[PDB]
Design a binder for this molecule. Structure first.
Ligand SMILES: Nc1nc2c(ncn2[C@@H]2O[C@H](COP(=O)(O)OP(=O)(O)O)[C@@H](O)[C@H]2O)c(=O)[nH]1
Length: 159
């Protein structure tokens, strides 16, 4: 270590969408076919940020101190996208008002099984005033893009 800043980030969404593998891809560049956390440091002006990222298999305790979150669904499972409103609600009830939130559609490699079209997801994100990006934890597609967008925006909000 040295790190100038510790940013707590929470992953939230239905079981089976890819949260634990988003965590393992970003922090240790690995994929696998109660509550846990992992860390990874990035550098900007030479300023070093330690991302402390969480997921679950304590709601007040889980959200406390979080400065960012990824809201995650599965682009192949309609129910996971419908359930995003509920997870956003739980987040709003329990998180700091200045928390930075990003919508993520995972499993983008399952091209032929898509049920959620990207314009419909973008429409929802804009309504909730969030950025939206599609990822593949399996193929690594856009994983660094999603986490770095989140971390740089938290730094800007903080500064
Ligand atoms: N094809 C594909 N499968 C994935 C992807 N991400 C996760 N999975 C698989 O989907 C299942 C659930 O993922 P997991 O990380 O355990 O979901 P969680 O319950 O949200 O933590 C596992 O069998 C993963 O290997 C992905 O991007 N593409």
């Amino acid at each position: 270590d040295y790190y100038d800043y510790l940013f707590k980030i929470v992953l939230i969404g239905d079981s089976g969408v890819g949260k634990s593998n988003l965590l393992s891809r970003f922090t240790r560049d690995e994929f696998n076919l109660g509550v846990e956390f992992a860390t990874k440091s990035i550098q900007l002006n030479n300023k070093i940020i330690k991302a402390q990222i969480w997921d679950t298999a304590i709601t007040s305790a889980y959200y406390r101190g979080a400065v960012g979150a990824l809201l995650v669904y599965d682009i192949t499972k309609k129910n996971s996208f419908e359930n995003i409103e509920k997870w956003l609600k739980e987040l709003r009830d329990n998180a700091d008002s200045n928390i930075v939130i990003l919508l993520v559609g995972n499993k983008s490699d399952l091209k032929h099984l898509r049920v959620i079209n990207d314009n419909d997801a973008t429409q929802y994100a804009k309504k909730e005033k969030l950025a939206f990006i599609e990822t593949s934890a399996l193929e690594a597609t856009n994983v660094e893009l999603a986490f770095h967008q989140l971390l740089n925006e938290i730094y800007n909000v903080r500064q």
